[PDB]
Amino acid sequence: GDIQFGKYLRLSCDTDSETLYELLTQHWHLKTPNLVISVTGGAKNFALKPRMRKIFSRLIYIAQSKGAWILTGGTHYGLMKYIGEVVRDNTISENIVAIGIAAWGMVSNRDTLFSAQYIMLYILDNNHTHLLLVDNGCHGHPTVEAKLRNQLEKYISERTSQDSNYGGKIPIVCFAQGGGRETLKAINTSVKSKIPCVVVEGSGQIADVIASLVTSSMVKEKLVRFLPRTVSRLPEEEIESWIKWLKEILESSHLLTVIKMEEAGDEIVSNAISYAL
C-alpha cells in the first residue's frame, strides 16, 4: 500500500536483500554514499534532552549534506518522531532519504491496497519518506525487523560504489544512543560485521554503560547503577545474555567509538563519525 497525504510496502522475511536493494535504487532514489542508521528504543518513554536535541539536529544536517540514508524504527515514538521532525524541518528549508523499517504484525490499522490512506497498536510515523513493514505472521507482534534490517545493512555494506573514496565502499556508520535491550542486540549484530558503531555517553543507559566501560561484576554494577528498575524487572536468565553481549561489544574497540560529555563543540557529531570511519 502506497500512501501519500510516501511509498509503503509489506515485506516477508524470506525476501532477498538484493531484490529489495534493486527495487529501492532502480525504481525510486539515487545510490547511497552513506548509511547512517540510528538505533534506539521503540518505547514512547524518550526523555528529550537539550544536548541530545542539538546532537541529533547536527546529525540530520550532516546526513543531508552528504546525502546519507537514514534507517530508523519509524513508529512515531520518542526519538523516532523527533528524528523525523528534523527531516521535515530541513525539507522545508537536495532531499533526505529516511527509510523506516517497522513490523506489520505490531501495526494497528490495516489498509490493504489503489493508494489506500488512513489517519490517526504501534501506529507508524508518516513523516518518513519510505516505510518498510515486514511480518510473515505472528499477530502477537514479536520483533522481526531485527533480522531483515541487519541483513540489508550488511548487503549494502558489501555493495561496491566507486565514489566517496573509502576503498570503493560505503561508510555504513551505526549511531546508537537508546537504552533499550533490542538496542543492545542491534549493536551486537552490527559489530559482528565490520560496522563501526558509535555511542554517546549521554542520557542513554545501555549506551552510558558501554561508554563508561571503554568482568561480570563490572557489567552488573554498571547496569544496576544505570538501569536499577530495568534490571530489577529483568530476570536472572536475561542477565547472562546481557553480560555476554556486553563482553562481545567490548571485545572490539576499533569499531566502537564514544562521544565525551565534556565536548560541547558544534561539530562533535561529524568528528565522531569521521574518526570512527
Binding site: 514512547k44 538501569l227 528498575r229
Partner: protein
C-alpha cells in the same frame, strides 16, 4: 524529598513525588529523578501537574513539562481554557481590562 522517597509508603508514587518537587522550586532534581528514563508516564500523566505549574508561575517547570513529551496542542481543551480564564484571571486585571475595553 528524601524523607518522602524513603518512606516506602509512597515510594512508588511518581505523581505525588513530582507534585512535591514542584511545590518547592527544584528543577534539577525533578528533571534528574522523576522523569529520568525508562518510565512510561505518557503525555496524559502531566496534565494536572502542568496545570498546577501554570497556576503557580513555574516557568522552568512549564518548559520542562513541554519539552519532555507533553503535547500542548492536546493539552489546551475547551473545558481547560474555560476553567483557566473563568477563575484564575486576576480580578484586578479583569476590571482593568474591562475599563480599558469600554473606554
Amino acid at each position: 524529598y528524601k524523607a518522602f522517597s524513603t518512606n516506602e509508603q509512597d515510594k512508588d508514587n511518581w505523581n505525588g513525588q513530582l507534585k512535591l518537587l514542584l511545590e518547592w522550586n527544584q528543577l534539577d532534581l525533578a528533571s534528574d529523578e522523576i522523569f529520568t528514563n525508562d518510565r512510561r508516564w505518557e503525555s496524559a500523566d502531566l496534565q494536572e501537574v502542568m496545570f498546577t505549574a501554570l497556576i503557580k508561575d513555574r516557568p522552568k517547570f512549564v518548559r520542562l513539562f513541554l519539552e519532555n513529551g507533553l503535547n500542548l496542542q492536546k493539552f489546551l481543551t475547551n473545558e481547560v481554557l474555560t476553567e483557566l480564564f473563568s477563575t484564575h484571571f486576576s480580578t484586578l486585571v479583569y476590571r482593568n481590562l474591562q475599563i480599558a475595553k469600554n473606554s
